[PDB]
């Protein structure tokens, strides 16, 4: 039982296309539901990643990509800023705290599948 | 790398197990079929990872596990030499040469797909 996360060879990309090579590949954008999973997403992916968390829809409020309020979270002191323009999208970052970011940013692709 | 992406999860696994995996995905064990390849599939798995090239049907002749005989072959210095009491599959090793090892033996999965 668990979910195994999976790293491309590709270059960092924007959440957009983060988002459809996850799908192309028949996966979700990784979400940690727990330090172990947070901790799992941080070894592979090993620069910034995004994850599949976003507050999109209603500012301030962050939700799963496939629908749900935050059961875990991991952010940074002082996070989420949403920083001038606003930040939307979360990467996991240093020692694997989070921080929101704009979404146009490029991250690492970490896809979630399973298991 | 080129015409190809690759996906991995670091997880080490014996051969059944990867080719399971690859299949879950709807990709295929990664095939290195020039150097350049070659060079990106050791890069993205970082230590040693199968390649979809077995020789369990005639033994000493390595064939595609999508069928067909080799076209690009990188084995290190006296290899394949199935060792003991059989080697059929493949591993890159050290510098991306290429090693015939048992199917039996666990090794880094990593499964490719058409870009
Ligand atoms: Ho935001
Ligand atoms: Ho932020
Ligand atoms: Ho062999
Ligand atoms: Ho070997």
Redesign the interface.
Known sequence: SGK???????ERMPFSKVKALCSE??GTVAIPRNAEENKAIQ??AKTSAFLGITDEVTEGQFMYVTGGRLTYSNWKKDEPNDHGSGEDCVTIVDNGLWNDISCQASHTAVCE?PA
């Open positions: 195994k996360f999976f790293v491309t060879n590709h590949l028949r070894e592979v599948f």
